[PDB]
Amino acid sequence: ELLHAPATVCGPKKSTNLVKNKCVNFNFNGLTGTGVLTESNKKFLPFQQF
């Protein structure tokens, strides 16, 4: 069933190769948007995502 608690069983999710320096429609873990991807020098803490 599916009406007792929050979903803890999920189906597999596929992945696609990432591209750089090109205008694409990216989708990172449910984050959506449009733009170009390039390398950075930011110093994200280990527990931070975006």
């Binding site: 608690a5 929050p6 803890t8 803490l45 527990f47």
Partner: peptide
């Protein structure tokens, strides 16, 4: 305990149980 320090997250458990009271297991806290 004088000063400032931020606390980083550790875990996130999807237990979903109602909690109203708690107790510790054992010299001061």
């Amino acid at each position: 305990p004088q000063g400032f320090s931020a606390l980083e997250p550790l875990v996130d458990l999807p237990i979903g149980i109602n909690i109203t009271r708690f107790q510790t297991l054992l010299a001061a806290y």
